[PDB]
């Protein structure tokens, strides 16, 4: 029986489109394969569950690219501030070519992509104060995912950054020891931490694509009629998660509108966009074999 990783609560849409692509080749295999997926983060950490999928200990799942980046480098580029100009050009890019070169640095790793999941853009929040300017960071202790990216993100505004498993975050925002993180609406809201950092400052400074994927070991394994149906079931359910993705958005922004937090949009997004220059200019100092990759991705 197979088993799959997912970070989020059961009622969340990563989860409902994970339990359908399992459903699904269920079904088509005759029960012939079955599966289960475990929802919260159960079954470890994102770094961790990573790791475990590409040794062939976990089956299935779906990983943000972000922590991704240390056991596949290709991945850096979609952890980069601002490369993407909008969520549907996300689409475009991760269903087109540059998805493409993703994916086979992916398989060369232990991975193979079924689909590319919505996760919306990223936007701070925290218990101190409203975010309108770079200079609002200064002093912040935010917290971070698991990638030195976005370490240097924060310190490029002034803000002091403390990577931290996801599952942690409620408690260090709400027993005050970090000010805030950033995530998406429903990540925000589905975690309850809206109700412990109650500014939302739509800086939407990240678009981090999200992989349902399977470990290679496990792909490699599987009858070539089976290979093929979980490929369709990878994809209808890639197609049912972007769907709920859209109505879970506007779900969650309105649940942390009516739970009183204070939303704030950024008037000026050029000041955000130059503060993350040297971000750019580090991954690339560290890693020029990147740069044709990232320029695919930020000249698109
Ligand atoms: O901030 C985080 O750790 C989380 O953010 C969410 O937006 C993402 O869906 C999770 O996979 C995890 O990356
Ligand atoms: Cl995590």
Same mark, same amino acid.
């Given at each position: 029986?197979?088993?799959?990783?997912?970070?989020?609560?059961?009622?969340?849409?990563?989860?409902?489109?994970? /339990?359908?692509?399992?459903?699904?080749?269920?079904?088509?295999?005759?029960?012939?394969?079955?599966?289960?997926?475990?929802?919260?983060?159960?079954?470890?950490?994102?770094?961790?569950?990573?790791?475990?999928?590409?040794?062939?200990?976990?089956?299935? %799942?779906?990983?943000?690219?972000?922590?991704?980046?240390?056991?596949?480098?290709?991945?850096?580029?979609?952890?980069?501030? =601002?490369?993407?100009?909008?969520?549907?050009?996300?689409?475009?890019?991760?269903? %087109?070519?540059?998805?493409?070169?993703?994916?086979?640095?992916?398989?060369?790793?232990?991975?193979?992509?079924?689909?590319?999941?919505? &996760?919306?853009?990223?936007? =701070?929040? $925290?218990?101190?104060?409203?975010?309108?300017?770079?200079?609002?960071?200064? %002093?912040?202790?935010?917290?971070?995912?698991?990638?030195?990216?976005?370490?240097?993100?924060?310190?490029?505004?002034?803000?002091? &950054?403390?990577?931290?498993? #996801?599952?942690?975050?409620?408690?260090?925002?709400?027993?005050?020891?970090?000010? %805030?993180? /950033?995530?998406?609406?429903?990540?925000?809201?589905?975690?309850?931490?809206?109700?412990?950092?109650?500014?939302?400052?739509?800086?939407?400074?990240?678009?981090?694509?999200?992989?349902?994927?399977?470990?290679?070991?496990? =792909?490699?394994?599987?009858?070539?009629?089976?290979?093929?149906?979980?490929?369709?079931?990878?994809?209808?359910?890639?197609?049912?998660?972007?769907?709920?993705?859209?109505?879970?958005?506007?779900?969650?922004?309105?649940?942390?509108?009516?739970?009183?937090?204070?939303?704030?949009?950024?008037?000026?997004?050029?000041? #955000?966009? @130059?503060?993350?220059?040297?971000?750019?200019?580090?991954?690339?100092? &560290?890693?020029? @074999?990147?740069?044709?990759?990232? $320029?695919?991705?930020?000249?698109?």
């Amino acid at each position: 029986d197979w088993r799959g990783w997912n970070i989020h609560v059961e009622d969340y849409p990563v989860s409902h489109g994970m /339990e359908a692509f399992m459903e699904e080749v269920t079904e088509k295999t005759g029960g012939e394969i079955k599966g289960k997926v475990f929802h919260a983060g159960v079954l470890g950490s994102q770094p961790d569950a990573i790791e475990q999928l590409r040794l062939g200990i976990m089956d299935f %799942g779906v990983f943000s690219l972000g922590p991704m980046g240390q056991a596949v480098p290709a991945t850096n580029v979609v952890s980069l501030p =601002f490369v993407f100009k909008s969520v549907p050009q996300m689409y475009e890019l991760m269903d %087109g070519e540059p998805g493409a070169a993703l994916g086979k640095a992916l398989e060369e790793k232990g991975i193979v992509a079924l689909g590319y999941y919505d &996760a919306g853009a990223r936007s =701070f929040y $925290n218990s101190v104060k409203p975010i309108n300017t770079p200079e609002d960071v200064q %002093g912040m202790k935010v917290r971070v995912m698991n990638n030195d990216l976005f370490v240097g993100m924060i310190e490029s505004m002034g803000g002091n &950054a403390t990577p931290m498993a #996801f599952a942690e975050v409620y408690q260090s925002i709400k027993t005050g020891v970090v000010d %805030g993180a /950033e995530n998406n609406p429903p990540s925000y809201e589905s975690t309850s931490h809206f109700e412990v950092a109650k500014y939302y400052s739509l800086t939407q400074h990240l678009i981090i694509p999200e992989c349902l994927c399977m470990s290679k070991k496990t =792909f490699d394994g599987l009858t070539p009629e089976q290979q093929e149906i979980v490929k369709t079931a990878g994809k209808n359910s890639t197609d049912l998660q972007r769907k709920l993705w859209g109505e879970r958005e506007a779900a969650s922004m309105k649940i942390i509108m009516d739970g009183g937090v204070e939303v704030n949009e950024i008037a000026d997004k050029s000041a #955000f966009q @130059e503060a993350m220059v040297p971000v750019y200019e580090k991954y690339l100092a &560290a890693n020029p @074999e990147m740069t044709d990759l990232v $320029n695919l991705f930020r000249n698109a």
